[PDB]
Amino acid sequence: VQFKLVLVGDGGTGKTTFVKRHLTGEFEKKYVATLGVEVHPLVFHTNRGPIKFNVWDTAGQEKFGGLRDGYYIQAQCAIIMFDVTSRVTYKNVPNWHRDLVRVCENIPIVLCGNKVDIKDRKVKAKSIVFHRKKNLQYYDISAKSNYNFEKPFLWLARKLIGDPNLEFVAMPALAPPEDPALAAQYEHDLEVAQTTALPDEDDDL
Amino acid sequence: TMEEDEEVLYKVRAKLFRFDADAKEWKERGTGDCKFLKNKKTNKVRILMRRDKTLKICANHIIAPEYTLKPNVGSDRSWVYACTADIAEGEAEAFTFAIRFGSKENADKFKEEFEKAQEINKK
Amino acid sequence: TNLEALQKKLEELELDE
Amino acid sequence: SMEGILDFSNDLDIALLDQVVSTFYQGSGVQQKQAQEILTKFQDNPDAWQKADQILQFSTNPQSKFIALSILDKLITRKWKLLPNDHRIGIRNFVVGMIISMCQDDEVFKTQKNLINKSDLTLVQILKQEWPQNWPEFIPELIGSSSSSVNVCENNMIVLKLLSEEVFDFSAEQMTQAKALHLKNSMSKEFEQIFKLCFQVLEQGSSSSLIVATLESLLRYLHWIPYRYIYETNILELLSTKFMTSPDTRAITLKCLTEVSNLKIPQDNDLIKRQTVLFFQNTLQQIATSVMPVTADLKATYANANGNDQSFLQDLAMFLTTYLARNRALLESDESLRELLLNAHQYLIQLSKIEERELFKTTLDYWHNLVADLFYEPLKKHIYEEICSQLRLVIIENMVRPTIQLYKSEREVLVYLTHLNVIDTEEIMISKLARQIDGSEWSWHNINTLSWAIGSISGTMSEDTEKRFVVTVIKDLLGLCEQKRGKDNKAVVASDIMYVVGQYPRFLKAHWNFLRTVILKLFEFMHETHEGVQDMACDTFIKIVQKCKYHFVIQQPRESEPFIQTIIRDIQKTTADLQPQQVHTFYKACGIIISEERSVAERNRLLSDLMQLPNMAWDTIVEQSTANPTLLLDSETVKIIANIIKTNVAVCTSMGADFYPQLGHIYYNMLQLYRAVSSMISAQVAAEGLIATKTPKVRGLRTIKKEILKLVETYISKARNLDDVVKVLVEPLLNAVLEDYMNNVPDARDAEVLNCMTTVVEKVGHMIPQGVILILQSVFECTLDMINKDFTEYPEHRVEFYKLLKVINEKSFAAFLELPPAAFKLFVDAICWAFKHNNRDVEVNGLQIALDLVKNIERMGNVPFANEFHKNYFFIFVSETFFVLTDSDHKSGFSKQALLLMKLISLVYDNKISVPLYQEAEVPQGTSNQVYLSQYLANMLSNAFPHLTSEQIASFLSALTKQCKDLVVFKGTLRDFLVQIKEVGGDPTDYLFA
Ligand SMILES: Nc1nc2c(ncn2[C@@H]2O[C@H](COP(=O)(O)OP(=O)(O)NP(=O)(O)O)[C@@H](O)[C@H]2O)c(=O)[nH]1
């Protein structure tokens, strides 16, 4: 049970950061623009079984657009991303939406306003209305603070499986298992690890 | 959840990091409840930690009596230690872990719960 | 008395048992 | 081996392309990944378009044909005019022919919609280039060909829909003003025949797919077509009756009628009013008989999520709110339209019960519109009394925690509704409270929601009615708390009790004995170990104080002293169990009260007594740590110092100018402490390296320095005696922070130093010209070197740096006049460096500094510094501004780039620059600056955009200089330029648009 998800939006809105947070749990602080698209399998465990998203993380910068709307062919769902600290990224939301629905005429789409963790918010909630006439689900999200970061996938999963009561459930936790030829190896890796300070030491966790 | 035959000795809010040696960088692995799960049939203690909301496993390994908690240069509320067999993302892999807590008290309390579990796992 | 009883009833607001 | 197609020396292996394409779409892993990079390079090859016709003819893979059309699209969009003419007609005939072939074959017209839609779009891209000037028979032949087959008639509706979108909906940025106007006029001229074909299809049936495609294109037309086509035909009757019955056409028809509810019509005609009433009546009738009756439970329907029910209910909410917000007055007077008015609002009532955040906000916006009108418009509220009564319950039951914006909207609607019928609002809230007491609706979420709703209507009832309401509520809440078991339940209700009383300060201010009891109760809760209680007690305390402060500063009847004295007296026992952040809130609250005392001697006495415990702890450490500086590495000692400064920050935050006596008590020793901590940080970096800046010990030391600066910032930003700031505060502050900043390694420099200096220059900058010079000397060059290597390192220093340069350029411009010429050149470089940032904070400040710097130079007049400034940096600023305007990586700053450029150009065409901007060998003598400016810009654009013709550059520059007094037109000419540089062969006459 696999579903193709295309993720579109302006460059720098955090599309790749959002995907990596779901893939590995990390938060990539650097902006390394995507070249064309990066496909990643993403699996969630639900009370209706596991659902697998094949995420097509497309490129936002025009100079790296690649096949552009060619990536949308046969997509079964999508996420449109913008940045609530950049008004131009919300102004371009109708452009991404137009290009998307011209290829995929009837798929569930989530509109996501990323980076709500930033204090100086530029796109105010009262100004975000584009999703209404287009029947998109909207969420404030932050890949940095993980605010609502699961909501877009939960909503898409409910629409794709067709069960509004679908929920995420905990994976079955197997029993974990139980040489001095590598003792000096792990000690060297631990020495450098203790001398590299953990990031974001002023955060709550 | 496959946590039926286990009892919870300790539970604490924490953030789990893994060291990217080939990048000279720490990388987050998950945030959520870190639990000391004690099996009632094999009499062994393990680490189980699940991410909030998605409930995905970011730590799954036995509290080996040979592991040593060591502080990080930039934190008074964290412990760094090496792990040789963790099955959070498949088969057992080696990781240098760091785990941070809300305060120095919880980090101290975690340390005194971590070796107490180490005493149990050698019996 | 109505506002006097209210003041006394709030004075007795306690969280324990 | 898949890299076999990238070699265009051979011939294209079509079968290999179809396999590479399917490997990318259906494969996975490394095979898909390098097939991806191969397809990108094949598509990005400038000659690939020549190989697009054999792909579209011989390939067996629809995705391959899609990619071939994409390669064509890039060619038609960017290089169509550069082609030989016969190629343009060949491509155009090939696309037309292929579309005709795909519509005749029923299995490809049904199973390859993506390919046909992409082909229709490629055709539309050609029409934008060729139509109508080189294709005047397209529309007549499209209509003629539509009568042949049904598949072509339906496909022609898709082409017209996409045409309408490209010309009217998406043209404003994608094409020049002239080209857009040309295309709009062309469609407008020939729409009469388009509407006839569309209307005939809608009236004669019968293919549902043909009907839907025709309705979809009508949706786009409604954005721009004249109103006569909608009201002077029968199409409103078709939409509101026939097409509402069939679910295939219902969704698009509802969206068409929603757009009709927005058309430009005459508000004088009595039949257009009747036609606006008529289609609404028909639509609501079809909904009641074909979809669901007005009593239906839309909340359950939406939650079941069957079929397209969610999208339909969303579209119904949009339709009703849109129509009723514009036309509900048409239904309010006629008695025969009353039931139609109320059923429609009853559908909205039912829609408002749906659990869907975004949908609720849509309906809530309409309710806000309605109840506001019933509050102000005569003879209206009696119509909606049953609607409004239901709405009160809906909003009370959906009250959110006080999203920030959503609560304000709910409060305003609920307050309007309370004005309209106080009595009905009271009984609903007391009923809901009774249902919390008997347990039928008891819930933590339900009791909190009701408390928020009760607290939101504060100030809408008369004070006497409010009194009895508050007493009834607080008494019933106290009985609820008394009756529940366990600290979890009792804490929730006690929290709600404190929230409600906090929301009614008019009640608290009229009953001192009750107010005192409340405060004394909050002091008890400040010892509660249960989580959240201490935070709630502190938040309620300062909230109540902010509104009733006067009743704590005066002596109440039958009291021996103002209650503020009683609070300060017991402050150690009251705050003994609180965390430091909570103690700071407490002290801030006390500071709010003290500032109400306008007797100076009495206010300073209360300030001295309030600050007694932190002052005693401060005098202890200042003596202990100065003799001798080892305790400053003790963890506990650093924490005590920071918490003492934070307490001073909290009190200074609420007292502002009145804080000066307490600041004088610690100021000199605090600055000395700042120096000692600064030494220890530098010593720790020396002994352990740059990693020391990340250790807890040093981070604790930097916290002290940050809090010291924040305290100074807080007072100076709010000071009233600016003279004392200048003679007492500024000079010892600069001696403490500037040299320490300058002589620290970059990783040890606190960016808060720059922010503190920004505050000082903001308020007293006009009074300390020599101090401003010393600030630049100490931080300018060393900070610039930290941030001029890339765009990422030191983000805080980056933002504070340009905030500081901005305020210095505003308040003490003479400081830059004192810089040596080499330093002033670094100033200009740093401004242009800020242009190139994508960081909006840096970019906006950098453009503002450039604009303010030019105005600073202009107001100097004809003097050697201004003349030299223009010869040295005028064209630098012109060329750097053009660069960020045209590189497509700084689009967020377009507006302020345009204005800065307009200011630079207008200077030359207003002869405000005395000197010639050229050297007298570059150009013959006597040449005006205007002539040289055009020659400089023409050469600059010719080298920066070599694909432009000289005639384009000349026409653009001619229009730009003529329009340097009209920002709206100026910006339109820049946007036209930004379009033409993306292509080859742009029409130079486009710049004559205005
Ligand atoms: N403060 C904050 N920053 C975020 C957040 N999410 C992403 N970012 C930051 O935004 C920047 C852009 O990163 P990226 O994920 O690559 O954006 P993108 O949309 O994939 N770029 P492109 O479309 O060109 O491939 C990163 O530096 C990242 O740290 C967020 O939630 N909060």
Ligand SMILES: [Mg+2]
């Ligand atoms: Mg990316």
